[model samples]
Target: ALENLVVLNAASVAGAHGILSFLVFFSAAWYIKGRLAPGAAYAFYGVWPLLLLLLALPPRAYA
Candidate 1:
C-alpha cells in the first residue's frame, strides 16, 4: 500500500523540486543582474547560464 502511494506521489515531488530549482536560479540571476547592471538586467539574465557554466569549470591552481 505504502509502496504504491510512493510511486503515485513521486511525480508531484519531482515536479515541485524542479519548479523550486528553477525559481532559485531565476531569482539569483535576476538579483545579480539587477545589482550589476540595472539597465541591461534583462539581457544579462538572458545569458545568465554562462555564469553558472563558468563557475562549474575546473579551477587552475597557481604554484
Candidate 2:
C-alpha cells in the first residue's frame, strides 16, 4: 500500500478513475471519428455515456 504519496477518500479515487476513463474513451472516439463519419460518431458519443450511467442500477439487490 502507498503510505503517504497521496490521500483521498475511496469514493473520490473511484470518481477520478471513472472520469479519466471517460476522457480517454472520448478522445479516442474523437480521433477515430475524425478519420470516419460524423453521424455514427454523434450517436456513439451520446449512447456510451448513457449506457454507463445505467451500470449503477437500483441499490441493494440482495434484500
Candidate 3:
C-alpha cells in the first residue's frame, strides 16, 4: 500500500523506523539473557508489544 507518507518527516514511515527502534531495545535484553546462559531455549527475554525475538538456539529442538 503506497498510502504512505511525505519523506523527510516523522510519519513518513509509520511502522518503519519506529518499529525497528524496538529491535535495539530487544537486542539489549536478548544479549544480556544470552550472556547469562549460553543460547536461547525456544525463545528468550525480549521487548514486546512488538515481538523482537532473538531465537538463538540452533535449528532443531533441544528440550
Cα deviation at 19, candidate 3, in Å, is 1.4
Query: Which ten contiguous residues of candidate 3 have the minimum total lDDT?
Result: 52-61
Model 1 spans with C-alpha error above 4 angstroms = 1-39, 61-63
Best by TM-score: 2
User: Candidate 2: misplaced stretches above 4 Å?
Assistant: 1-33, 56-63
Better of 1 and 3 by TM-score: 1
lDDT per residue as tens, model 2, 1-63 = 222112223323668534544554676766864665667855777766663433322222221
Error of 3 at 45 (Å): 19
When summed lDDT is taken over every stretch of 10 residues in candidate 1, the lowest stretch is: 54-63
Q: What's each prediction's TM-score?
A: 0.29, 0.29, 0.26
RMSD of each: 12.7, 9.1, 12.2
Off by over 4 Å in 3: 1-13, 35-63
For model 1, how does the per-residue alpha-carbon lDDT over 1-63 read when each residue is reduced to its tens digit?
133234335524667533433543576676664565456755766876564433322233121
Report backbone clashes per prediction: 0, 0, 0
Tell me the deviation in Å of residue 48 in model 1: 2.4
